[PDB]
Amino acid sequence: CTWPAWEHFKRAYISDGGRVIDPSDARKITTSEGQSYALFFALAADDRPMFDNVLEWTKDNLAQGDPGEHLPAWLWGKKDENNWTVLDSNSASDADIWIAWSLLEAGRLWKEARYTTLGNALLNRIAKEEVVTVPGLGPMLLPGKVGFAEETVWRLNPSYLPPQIARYLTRFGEPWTTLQETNHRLLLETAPKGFSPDWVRYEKSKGWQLAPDKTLISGYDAIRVYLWVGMMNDHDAQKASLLERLKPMAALTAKKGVVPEKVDVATAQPRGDGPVGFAAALLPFLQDRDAQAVQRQKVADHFPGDDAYFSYVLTLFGQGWDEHRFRFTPRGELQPDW
């Protein structure tokens, strides 16, 4: 009853103490993102021992022992020859959200009230520290607790709140009820050519900043937008509207046979070939049987090695969903494959 790609990921990328190590950083870093993804994959795999191992490392080393009182620091690793510690105390809200959702779903599915308590506390802390009311938009999720909000300009990351997780979180009331609506609009309104940006700015009295720009690109963050949308349950009434908006990414991938590495959000111009992780990330997204099969062949023949954290986690998400390793319900709950 095992998931072999996850078994190997545990052996090759997760320390005995429970931290996900990106081997491609000289500092041998752990990110809150790596931890949150490990929590999700452990829950999908019905792997409570690794879930607890990862969670305990996260709370003690990223959150001063209590994510309910401290948002996890996003970056941890080797600072000096003699000091392995937090490298950046700032948060990353995509990770905070995935941790909170994974805690709530583990508490529900494993019937363990402590996961629920910690997830509820973390979710309230996310709301307190990195959800703000933006004039003209309403409540929005900032990419982190500092550094993305100023008096007249805000910067958002469309990949940071998967639509199905937003749908799930509405069960806890405001601000999650309204955040689901503002997130849906964010995804539709900032993809004027059908490509979602890594990062997008909103300016007071001016609206979204969508003029052509070298930093307004569908790249290594925005690839996950298409992934999240593809993994929505078909009975979520809003999946269709998101697939329709983002359909040019599917058409471009199918035409080329290769997922582009970067696409200019304002002009739709592609450049570069994405890594195997981008191929896997689009498996749930591509609705055409043939285009999907072309990417499936790439993932099968170029499966990521032990030196490729990013392509590996994208592959666990996309190939995992492609292999029915997990599903989401129409409300964004985990539909486990146990």
Side-chain angles (χ1 to χ4, degrees), residues 13 42 44 52 54 122 158-159 171 196 204-205 207 248 265 310 315 318 334:
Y13 289 89
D52 284 329
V54 167
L122 173 52
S159 76
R171 74 192 48 199
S196 184
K204 193 175 182 184
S205 290
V265 165
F310 181 63
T315 298
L334 178 64

Side-chain angles (χ1 to χ4, degrees), residues 167-196:
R167 177 57 68 189
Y168 178 94
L169 297 170
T170 64
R171 74 192 48 199
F172 303 103
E174 295 296 354
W176 309 105
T177 304
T178 298
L179 278 168
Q180 188 279 333
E181 301 181 51
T182 62
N183 186 57
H184 189 67
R185 288 202 74 92
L186 164 68
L187 291 178
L188 293 171
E189 292 182 0
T190 61
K193 296 290 184 196
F195 299 91
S196 184

Side-chain angles (χ1 to χ4, degrees), residues 209-317:
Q209 297 305 293
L210 301 176
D213 190 322
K214 176 183 290 185
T215 176
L216 189 80
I217 51 156
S218 187
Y220 287 76
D221 279 4
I223 188 65
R224 277 164 279 186
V225 174
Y226 319 95
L227 170 56
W228 311 143
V229 167
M231 295 193 296
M232 294 171 78
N233 194 287
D234 279 353
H235 297 91
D236 184 321
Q238 282 165 332
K239 180 178 185 174
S241 69
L242 295 170
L243 286 176
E244 181 61 25
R245 172 65 289 184
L246 303 176
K247 191 163 60 150
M249 171 60 102
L252 177 58
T253 294
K255 181 185 181 173
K256 295 303 175 67
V258 57
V259 186
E261 189 188 23
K262 303 175 179 309
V263 187
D264 187 309
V265 165
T267 73
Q269 181 174 353
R271 47 183 176 278
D273 292 359
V276 70
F278 284 28
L282 291 204
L283 291 173
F285 175 71
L286 298 168
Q287 304 297 302
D288 180 80
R289 185 77 163 91
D290 280 2
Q292 200 188 50
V294 167
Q295 300 311 310
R296 183 173 301 113
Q297 184 192 304
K298 287 193 190 323
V299 172
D301 290 354
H302 303 285
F303 188 90
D306 298 351
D307 62 340
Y309 155 82
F310 181 63
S311 279
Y312 210 112
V313 293
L314 285 189
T315 298
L316 286 168
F317 273 124

Side-chain angles (χ1 to χ4, degrees), residues 137-184:
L137 295 182
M140 297 286 286
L141 182 73
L142 298 171
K145 64 190 196 185
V146 293
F148 295 90
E150 297 152 39
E151 182 150 14
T152 62
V153 187
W154 300 260
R155 181 164 139 245
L156 300 144
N157 191 311
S159 76
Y160 273 25
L161 186 51
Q164 56 273 73
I165 294 188
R167 177 57 68 189
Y168 178 94
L169 297 170
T170 64
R171 74 192 48 199
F172 303 103
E174 295 296 354
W176 309 105
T177 304
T178 298
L179 278 168
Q180 188 279 333
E181 301 181 51
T182 62
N183 186 57
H184 189 67

